[PDB]
Design a protein around this nucleic acid. Structure first.
Ligand SMILES: Nc1ncnc2c1ncn2[C@@H]1O[C@H](COP(=O)(O)OP(=O)(O)O)[C@@H](O)[C@H]1O
Ligand SMILES: [Mg+2]
Lengths: 107, 80, 95, 93, 588, 88, 98, 107, 93
DNA sequence: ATCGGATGTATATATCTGACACGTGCCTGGAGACTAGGGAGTAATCCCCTTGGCGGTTAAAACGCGGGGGACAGCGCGTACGTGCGTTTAAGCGGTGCTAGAGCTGTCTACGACCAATTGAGCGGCCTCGGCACCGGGATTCTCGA
DNA sequence: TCGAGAATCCCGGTGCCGAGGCCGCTCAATTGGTCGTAGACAGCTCTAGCACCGCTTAAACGCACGTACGCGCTGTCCCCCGCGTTTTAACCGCCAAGGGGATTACTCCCTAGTCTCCAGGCACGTGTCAGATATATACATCCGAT
């Protein structure tokens, strides 16, 4: 028969043979189940979709049509859950979320 | 002569502002120099160890990424 | 002539808005090689390694200054003093 | 020389969500590193989770539990929904 | 008469244990007692064949007893001369039995029926030990706190001369009592309590105890009871155990009590256990029973009221197999199938709904909260309770209600207030003075308290309720004797009118399961110890039949299957096989 | 009168009494304590417990058990970087 | 007049007592009730060991003690000797779990 | 032939066979060199000896001849680099290093 | 069943350093946890080191680099010295 | 207070220019097909440990009080920091010169895995006694109004 | 304004209970054969890293004025503490039960491993457009005088 990719059967976009290969030749355990690469690929794809959605939102909010690292880092820091997941992560060429202490403002 | 004095007064001032700081004492510059020096020594020591193991004599970016990851502060971008 | 405390806020906006590096390049690279000179002599650096080091240094110092600023404000002040660095750094957990 | 990457897959997902938006190269590297980092986090947690139970296989249950343990809040909810959906659709075929 | 006085200096040479380390196997006494043991009956060797393979010392013990292989005692068949009173014959018989055990260098559990005056037997026997055997003291006594005062009130009643005191009070007053009298050696008998005994171990070890009495012996069942552990350090000559009835639920219990009495015969559990359940096939179970009778016959003394003194309309019981009310149906389903409630440990939860659903969270509708007919409207046990309660009231019989959970007692408080009855409650949290006042007011000869509530666990104390005549009990207990003494509370010596127990029972609920288990245990006890010596009428008639069926079923079953206790899961109940997201508007 | 509706007081977080807060404070080394540290402390303690217990229960779920055994709690604390020596 | 210690001494005696002892400082049953009541949310019908609850209490008390030490440093840093909630918020925000 | 333990040949006191087995059935890698368990056992034994010596010194200072977790924490928290190694570690039934801030002492 | 432990070996080391001393049970449990934890840290770091360099074996050099990465300051050099001693002695059997 | 002024900032427009999205060919890794074997599923067993309730001792917690010392607001002052202008020095960019340092192919060969056997090291269960906890009493000491 | 009083360290005797020593039994570490293949080693190429000159341009240095703020003083008052009294609820001891945690045995499905085959993905060009940058304009804000 013709070869029909495991990704397509899953319906995902991220590879499954590649995830399978890494989980196997990565010394995580002796034997890798059949369904595990499918699950992991789906989860990685979902997280990527979230990050890119928020980042594209921010990029549009600056009249630009390309996510640059500043947009990634800004979108990540604005959200709370992504900000907690990547808490100890410094995104290179990101920057600081704009913030002024109210006490500092003139009166 | 005095490499850590290469961290000028205004550069520390820029970093302070990007942190959100308005007025600055005159004694902050010396302590900032000290803190930066300690951080650099830790990271550089671990990076040099990593490159020792691989028998090389250059510290590639990926070694520094590993060292930072080990310190407890990842760095997306350069690595991978 | 701007009243004192005016230019500072505009500096803060200028820098909290941008993304570039703030420390010069060569002074930091010299510092890196000089510090590394102890652990092993006759050692080379690939440039991307120094860029990584500068990014990490920038981020560490920026977060440190935010916590210093919070400590200063907590003591009913707007000036930052060395006691603030020391308090913030001890609380954070490296003393 | 072959440096494998999740470039084309990330770009497929991006075209899926924001159809007329690009992505830079530094942004691309950051996203790829992010995918690798979260991959090793999940895989390592699943490995430890199997070893704890004196088990010698990485099933899908271990992946699900690692997802529930690392991801915070409703990221966990939506991610487990996605994984379950994909594995079901897979086994059906 | 004929004894040295309480010269504390004289006593200190006898009370205090001079050789703080001196303790040996006592081969001679072991051999003497074990020889007499084998003399009266021969199976007792079955202990030694095992424990000798266990003990290198029992090698030579068995040897010594095996190479070899005042005829009448002082039949003290009179009221004791020194005790200032009179003794009814079986009292003297027990006294003679105690003396006879004393002579054979052993002792036995006294386990007579309650109200038979056991402590009088004990005081008489100790007085015998003093006046006749020229041994003043010391002795130790452990009792429930409630009866701490009774022991002394009768010590200073029959044999006034002897000295006794109580370690009653908190740390400072107990401590000064210790230092002044206890270590001053100014007594003959002590009276502590379970908690005290566990709390005054360090001084009370320092005495060459002659006996260690224990009122309510059955408290020593779990051989890892820290009370038991402590009592295994008090060096003594012999011991004594007093309990209304031993062998509460399990058979291992009696081995535990025997360990306390004679740890140099019953020293191992495996032999007892296997010898007992040593017939998987069931032709020799009668022989096993006769063996156990011929084993325990010497040690144990047991008496019955129903044969020592009549004048006691025996009691009678009915097990009203009540149905289930509607919300009880729904709540039973909800519990079985299914908001913090922690539904686990459900067999208690079932006992909650099966008595009254209001015990849960908001089963009664509201707020507002109102007392009205909706109480009894939908609680089957409470329905039949109201019906029978009215029938008793028109006859006018004071009623005692027992329960396991005091929350049901509070529900009954509300319901009693609803129905214009004066009730009286003595629960576990009641203060002592409140307790005595409440029981006195109920026991006033002119009392209007129709109902006297109390929990069944708290009912076993020294409280006396001979005044009433019906002792209705909501739910049967896990231990049939546990509530049997509660029922006895109203059937003690002094009650004339017939006692009319009404242990309430539900159908198809766990209540039948629990009742079956209780009946199994009660049958076990009876076998082992007996041979040693809407409309109320229609429900009554229906229930007086299935109870006959159950007692007939358990009337003759094999000992083996009697203790098997099939783990019949109650989880049937007619059939059952269980047990996007937020996005920021603008990122400018 | 009509009394069957008995409620519970000091719900469950008030069980961390004021003096216990003070004792923990003293071991911490403080001398004077304001009046609003008690509520703030109960809040922070409750948050910490929520996180740890959530991870412990996840571990218990996965092994198909129903008893949160000690080693699960050790694993959960470790996963948060609060390694605990002494329980396995 | 009765002997009455001046404000401050008894607190220092207590600090010495509790920095030299090593027992636990929160009562057992209240903490166990708190743990089970919290855990009712995530999975109904759970049962705990005992070592699990003791481990939880050890970790909890250690965490709170460290927090109070940092709180005290913050309070002293503001020219005070009294700890107030603002100190705790500052301490936790610096630590990194705001 | 007579069986001679691998520990004895190394001269150590920790087991090299057990460390070998744990290194193997641990999914750290798929081959474990012959000389790795030896070197690892030596390191573990050195650290054990160090911490135990400090703990015993503390115990004798407290006029005791056993070691209790309080002495272990005194040893660990009094030393400097050992304190860094066990930085995030909580030692159950340990206690706290005695310390009162100087400002709070009476005048 | 059969719980492995380091209790006996810890006792042998203790009798070496402070011959006239003992150790309670809790302290022994703590020491056992400490040993497993340090073994886990060293072995995990050596595993990562091998993976980073495409190696397939955990040799002595991996352990030495891992112990030089974990332990701080003086501990690192002393432990490295003593491990090297033991390896030379064993290999010169 | 308001206003006009000066300064800095947000906005629209034209230009580039360097990176991104695209297209191709090749190859290696994933998918199809098949076999063997062992890990995990699923029954079934045992008994260890958990679950709720109750009772008594005793210390801790809750409460109210009296009073002082510290948290906070207000004032003054003087000092060190900011702002702005003028100077100068160093970063950055570019270009010279070289070579060692780090990444690909092909061949051993020693060493780590697998397998059989078999013995001894280690684990569990059972003792006994000494180190620690408990207690009582006495001298020392620090605190606090005279 | 030092003597009274309350907390503390030390010593001493005693009790008790947990650590350490012994003893059997089993399985997993050692011996000892074999043998594959990782990795060590020696070819290969290629390219990025190392002490000197020249030049532009801006950021760093230095300095003077003033000012507002950090610091110190004072007062005030009110919150928090030390303490004595009373309630309450841990804590330990206890009773009951059954769940479910850990163990065993057997079968089979699923997974590793081999062969075979081909197509998804990766590196190498490549064209064009999204964004940076400069300019000029409009407008928003700050600030001192009236
Ligand atoms: N002369 C007597 N002969 C027999 N019994 C007596 C005599 N005098 C008093 N008694 C009863 O003997 C009882 C002894 O206590 P008892 O009720 O047997 O305690 P328990 O309930 O522990 O068996 C007393 O309560 C008393 O009523
Ligand atoms: Mg009695």
């Amino acid at each position: 028969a013709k070869a029909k990719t495991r990704s397509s059967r899953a319906g995902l976009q991220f590879p499954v043979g590649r995830v399978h290969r890494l989980l196997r030749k990565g010394n995580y355990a002796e034997r890798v189940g059949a369904g595990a690469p499918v699950y992991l690929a789906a989860v990685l794809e979902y997280l990527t979709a979230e990050i890119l959605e928020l980042a594209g939102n921010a990029a549009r909010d600056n009249k630009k049509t390309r996510i640059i690292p500043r947009h990634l880092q800004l979108a990540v820091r604005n959200d709370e859950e992504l900000n907690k997941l990547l808490g100890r992560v410094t995104i290179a060429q990101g920057g600081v979320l704009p913030n002024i202490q109210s006490v500092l403002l003139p009166k | 002569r005095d490499n850590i004095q290469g961290i000028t007064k205004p550069a520390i001032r820029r970093l302070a502002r990007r942190g959100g700081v308005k007025r600055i004492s005159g004694l902050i510059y010396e302590e900032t120099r000290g803190v930066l020096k300690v951080f650099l020594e830790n990271v550089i020591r671990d990076a040099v160890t990593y490159t020792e193991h691989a028998k090389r004599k250059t510290v590639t970016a990926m070694d520094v990424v590993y060292a930072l990851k080990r310190q407890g502060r990842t760095l997306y971008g350069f690595g991978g | 002539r701007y009243r004192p405390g005016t230019v500072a806020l505009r500096e803060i906006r200028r820098y909290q808005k941008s993304t570039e590096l703030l420390i010069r390049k060569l002074p930091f690279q010299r510092l890196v090689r000089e510090i590394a000179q102890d652990f092993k002599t006759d050692l080379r650096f690939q440039s991307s390694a120094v860029m990584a080091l500068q990014e990490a240094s920038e981020a560490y110092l920026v977060a440190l200054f935010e916590d210093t600023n919070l400590c200063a404000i907590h003591a009913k002040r707007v000036t930052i003093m060395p006691k603030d660095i020391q308090l913030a750094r001890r609380i954070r957990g490296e003393r | 020389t072959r440096k494998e990457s999740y470039a084309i897959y990330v770009y497929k997902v991006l075209k899926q969500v924001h159809p007329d938006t690009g992505i830079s190269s530094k942004a691309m590297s950051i996203m790829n590193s992010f995918v690798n980092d979260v991959f090793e986090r999940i895989a390592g947690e699943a490995s430890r989770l199997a070893h704890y139970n004196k088990r010698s296989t990485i099933t899908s249950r271990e992946i699900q539990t690692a997802v529930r343990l690392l991801l915070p809040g409703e990221l966990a909810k939506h991610a487990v929904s996605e994984g379950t959906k994909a594995v079901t659709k897979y086994t059906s075929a | 008469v004929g004894l040295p006085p309480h010269d504390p200096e004289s006593n200190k040479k006898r009370y205090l244990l001079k050789d703080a380390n001196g303790k040996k196997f006592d081969l001679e006494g072991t051999t003497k007692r074990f020889e007499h043991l084998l003399s009266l009956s021969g199976l007792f060797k079955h202990f030694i064949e095992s424990k000798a393979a266990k003990d290198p010392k029992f090698r030579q013990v068995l040897d010594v007893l095996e190479e070899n292989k005042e005829s009448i005692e002082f039949q003290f068949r009179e009221s004791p001369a020194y005790v200032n009173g009179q003794l009814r014959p079986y009292q003297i018989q027990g006294v003679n039995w105690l003396v006879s055990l004393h002579k054979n260098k052993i002792a036995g559990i006294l386990a007579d029926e309650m109200g038979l005056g056991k402590t009088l037997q004990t005081i008489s026997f100790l007085g015998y030990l003093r006046y006749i055997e020229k041994i003043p003291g010391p002795f130790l006594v452990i009792a429930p706190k409630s009866t701490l005062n009774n022991w002394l009130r009768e010590i200073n009643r029959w044999t006034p001369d002897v000295n006794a005191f109580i370690l009653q009070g908190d740390k400072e007053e107990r401590a000064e009592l210790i230092q002044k009298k206890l270590l001053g050696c100014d007594f003959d008998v002590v009276i502590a309590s379970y908690e005290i005994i566990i709390r005054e171990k360090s001084p009370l070890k320092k005495i060459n105890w002659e006996y260690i009495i224990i009122d309510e012996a059955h408290r020593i069942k779990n051989e890892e009871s820290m009370l038991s552990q402590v009592l295994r350090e008090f060096t003594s000559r012999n011991r004594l155990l007093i309990t209304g009835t031993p062998l509460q639920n399990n058979l291992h219990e009696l081995w535990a009590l025997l360990n306390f009495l004679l740890p140099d015969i019953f020293s191992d559990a495996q032999d007892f256990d296997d010898w007992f359940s040593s017939e998987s096939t069931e032709e020799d179970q009668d022989k096993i029973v006769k063996q156990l009778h011929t084993v325990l016959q010497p040690f144990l003394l047991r008496r019955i009221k129903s044969d020592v003194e009549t004048s006691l309309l025996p009691k009678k019981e009915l097990n009203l197999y009540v149905g289930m009310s509607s919300m009880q149906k729904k709540w039973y389903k909800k519990i079985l199938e299914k908001s913090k409630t922690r539904l686990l440990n459900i067999m208690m939860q079932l006992r909650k709904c099966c008595n009254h659903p209001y015990l849960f969270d908001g089963a009664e509708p509201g707020p507002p909260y109102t007392t009205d007919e909706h109480l009894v409207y939908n609680a089957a046990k409470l329905q039949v309770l109201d019906k029978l309660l009215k029938k008793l009231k028109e006859e006018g019989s004071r009623v005692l209600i027992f329960s396991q959970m005091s929350r049901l007692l509070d529900i009954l408080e509300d319901y009693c207030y609803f129905r214009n009855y004066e009730y009286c409650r003595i629960d576990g949290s009641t203060a002592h003075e409140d307790r005595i006042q409440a029981i006195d007011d109920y026991n006033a000869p002119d009392s209007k308290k129709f109902v006297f509530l109390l929990t069944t666990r708290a009912g076993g104390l020294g409280i006396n309720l001979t005044s009433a005549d019906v002792v209705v009990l909501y739910d049967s207990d896990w231990n049939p004797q546990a509530d049997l003494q509660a029922m006895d509370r109203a059937h003690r010596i002094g009650q004339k009118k017939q006692v009319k127990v009404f242990r309430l029972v539900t159908d198809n609920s766990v209540e039948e399961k629990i009742l079956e288990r209780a009946t199994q245990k009660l049958r076990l006890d009876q076998l082992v110890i007996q041979q040693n010596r809407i409309d109320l009428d229609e429900l009554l008639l229906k229930s007086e039949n299935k109870t006959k069926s159950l007692n007939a079923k358990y009337e003759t079953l094999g000992l083996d299957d009697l203790q098997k206790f099939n783990q019949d899961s109650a989880y049937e109940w007619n059939g059952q096989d269980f047990k996007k997201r937020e996005r920021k508007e603008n990122y400018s």
